[PDB]
Every structure is written in C-alpha cells, then in structure tokens.
Amino acid sequence: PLSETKCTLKSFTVEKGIYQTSNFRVQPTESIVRFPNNLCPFGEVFN
Amino acid sequence: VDCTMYICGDSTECSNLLLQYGSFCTQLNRALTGIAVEQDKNTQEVFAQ
C-alpha cells in the first residue's frame, strides 16, 4: 500500500503528509439465489 | 467520489472503457480533493487564529 501512492505522485520523493491511494472494496463471498417456498404434473402425465 | 465505482458499478466491462477517457476519472478526485483539502483551511484560519 505504500508503493501504490508513489505511483500517484509519480515521484520517488514523497513529501511529509497524507496521500490518497486507490480505493479498496470488500468482495463477495458467495451468491445467494432465493425463490419463494407450483409443480408441473409430470408425475401425472408420465406415470 | 470514486469515479471508477460511481460510473461503472463494480464491473470491469465498464471499467475498461473508462480507461479510454483518461484523466477524467482521476482529475475529478484531484478537483474534489482540491476542495476538501482547503475546506479545512477555511476552518483553520477562521477559528484558529
């Protein structure tokens, strides 16, 4: 995280202070598909 | 305001194209930071003399 700011100032000298390096994001663990709790009568057609 | 995320929600398909407009993404941050930096200079000189 220190090296990425020096690429923002383009300089090898980094003046005393606070600099804003590229943002970070939290990333998703998993997908959650949810559909409510008919059925097609394939037991009534095929059987 | 993060241009990359604002314009392109979390998606590289849009993120790639944004690279073609160059500094438009960054220089806004430079503008906003330019504001927010001095916003404390205002309060600096007004209240703390």
Task: Give the resolution in Å.
Answer: 3.8
For A14, left (φ over 0), alpha (ψ -120 to 50), or beta? Answer: beta
CA gap B15, B20 in Å, rounded: 9
Partner B contacted by A23 (CB < 8 A): yes
**B21 CA: distance to closest CA in chain A (Å):** 18
Cα distance between residue B45 and residue B49, in whole Å = 6
Q: What residues contact residue A11 under an 8 Å CB cut-off, 6+ apart?
A: none
Report the C-alpha gap between B26 and B14 in whole angstroms. 16
Does the CB of A25 have a partner CB in chain B at under 8 Å?
Answer: yes
Please tell me if residue A10 touches chain B, with a CB cutoff of 8 Å: no
